[PDB]
């Protein structure tokens, strides 16, 4: 499923990400744009043999099981495929755990480079929230 920005903002708001762990809704929308381009089915291989899955490009080296990353941990205790569903519940739940690891939203390389310190409210501006 490819979300529109206001549709994703609405979904992320219902799922409780607005100001979750100190990050306003705009941060989560911006992160999803620069990670997956709002595509829940996005998959990207990393050079270490791991893969990034879904709307928030959650990595198989630490968070999910894809059965092809030797040395993987599965900290969100889920198959990586569950992060590819049209419903964002599993990706939101694993993101809530990731943001609580030592790096905050810097765990998302793209959020750090492209979103951090910018006008992130622009990503929810115009949406009837």
């Amino acid at each position, epitope marked *: 499923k490819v979300f529109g920005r206001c549709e994703l903002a609405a979904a992320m708001k219902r799922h409780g990400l607005d*100001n979750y762990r100190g*990050y306003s809704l705009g941060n989560w929308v911006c992160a999803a744009k620069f990670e997956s381009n709002f595509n829940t089915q996005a998959t990207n291989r990393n050079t270490d043999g791991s893969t990034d899955y879904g709307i928030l490009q959650i990595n198989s080296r630490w968070w999910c099981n894809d059965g092809r990353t030797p040395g993987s941990r599965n900290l969100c205790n889920i198959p990586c495929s569950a992060l590819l569903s049209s419903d964002i519940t599993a990706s939101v739940n694993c993101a809530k755990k990731i943001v609580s690891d030592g790096n905050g939203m810097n765990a998302w390389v793209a959020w*750090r480079n492209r979103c951090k310190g910018t006008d992130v409210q622009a990503w929810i501006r115009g949406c009837r929230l």
Partner: antibody
């Protein structure tokens, strides 16, 4: 127009405490990413601490537990409370405003903090 | 200034193309965290020179350019000028340290 003015710097004894202040104008400190960067005389830049727009705080391992970054909305000021100050904490302390990807947009002029007996 | 390393000094001649390397690791540049660059003139606070590996803020001359590849970054000065004599600092983010990191700094000298 955007301004960062540090104060509260000076001489303190080891094990002593000092509170740095950074009065800002041209923006809301509560809506920005603010950091402290220090520089020992004739040495390189060393990142100290940061406060996010949403309030998350992070510290260098060298200042962890001893230093506390904070901000007051009423006064539009960023603070650096330093405890158990040691000789090696002697440096020029810069208040800093972050831009995209923790890049630093604006710096203050710096305030000298000398930790000596 | 240990997880990012720079040469302590770089010396160039007027008009020379010189570069200042920033050597990182898998926990910073290697992870994909962008490199920022600062120029620090004598007795002054540093000023942002390059952001997000390659972007120049307004007022920064076109002779300054940045590049990133693998675990290292590079600050390039094409047509070196006497006014470029300063201390240069690379900066990134390190996931192992959970914060911003600076390189050790490079003293640039213009000889002529």
């Amino acid at each position: 127009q955007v301004q960062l003015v540090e104060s509260g710097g000076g001489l303190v004894q080891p094990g002593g405490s000092l509170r740095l202040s950074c009065a800002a104008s041209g923006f809301t400190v509560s809506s920005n990413y603010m950091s402290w960067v220090r520089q020992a005389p004739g040495k390189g830049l060393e990142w100290v601490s940061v406060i996010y727009s949403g309030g998350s705080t992070y510290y260098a391992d060298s200042v962890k537990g001893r230093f506390t970054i904070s901000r007051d909305n009423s006064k539009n000021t960023l603070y650096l409370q330093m405890n158990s100050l040691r000789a090696e904490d002697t440096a020029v302390y810069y208040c800093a405003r972050e831009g995209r990807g923790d890049s630093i947009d604006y710096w203050g002029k710096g305030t000298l903090v000398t930790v000596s007996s | 200034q240990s997880v990012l390393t720079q040469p302590p000094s770089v010396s160039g001649a007027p008009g020379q193309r010189v570069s200042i390397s920033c050597t990182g690791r898998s926990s910073n540049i290697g992870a994909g965290y962008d490199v920022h660059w600062y120029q620090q003139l004598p007795g002054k606070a540093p000023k942002l020179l390059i952001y997000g590996n390659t972007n120049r803020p307004s007022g920064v001359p076109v002779r300054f350019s940045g590049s990133m590849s693998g675990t290292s970054a590079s600050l390039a000065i094409t047509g070196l000028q006497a006014e470029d004599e300063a201390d240069y600092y690379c900066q990134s983010y390190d996931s192992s340290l959970s914060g911003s990191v600076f390189g050790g700094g490079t003293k640039l000298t213009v000889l002529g």
